[PDB]
Amino acid sequence: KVFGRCELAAAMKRHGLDNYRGYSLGNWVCAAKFESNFNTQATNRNTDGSTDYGILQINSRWWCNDGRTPGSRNLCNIPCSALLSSDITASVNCAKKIVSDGNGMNAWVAWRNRCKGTDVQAWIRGCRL
């Protein structure tokens, strides 16, 4: 499912992501935009052979099991197919785990190189949330 900008923001707020570990809702929308483009089915193979899954392009190396990432962990205890569901609940649950560590939303390359430092608030602008 390809989300709308505001639709998604609204859904993430519902899931306890607005200012989660100090990161306002616009940061999360911005990340989704440049990670998946709001498409929950986005998958992307990494050079190391791990695969990024879903709306927030969560990685098989650490967070989920795709059954083909040798030497990996599954710290969110989920199949990576759980991350392509149009119900964003496992993506968001697993995001809270990733951001709660020590590198924050710097774990998301697209956030760091495309959101960090921006007027991220623009991503929830004109959204009835």
Question: Active site residue: 18, 52, 87, 119, which one?
Answer: 52
Phi and psi of 101, rounded to 5°?
Answer: -90, -70
Whether 35 is catalytic is yes
Whether 7 is catalytic is no
Place of tokens 């200012």: 19
CA distance linking residue 90 with residue 84, whole number of Å: 9
Question: Active site residue: 18, 35, 66, 87, which one?
Answer: 35
Query: Residues annotated in the binding site for substrate, as ranges?
Result: 101
Query: Residues annotated in the binding site, as ranges?
Result: 101
Would the CA dihedral through 96, 86, 4, 7 be positive or negative?
A: negative
Active centre residues (catalytic): 35, 52
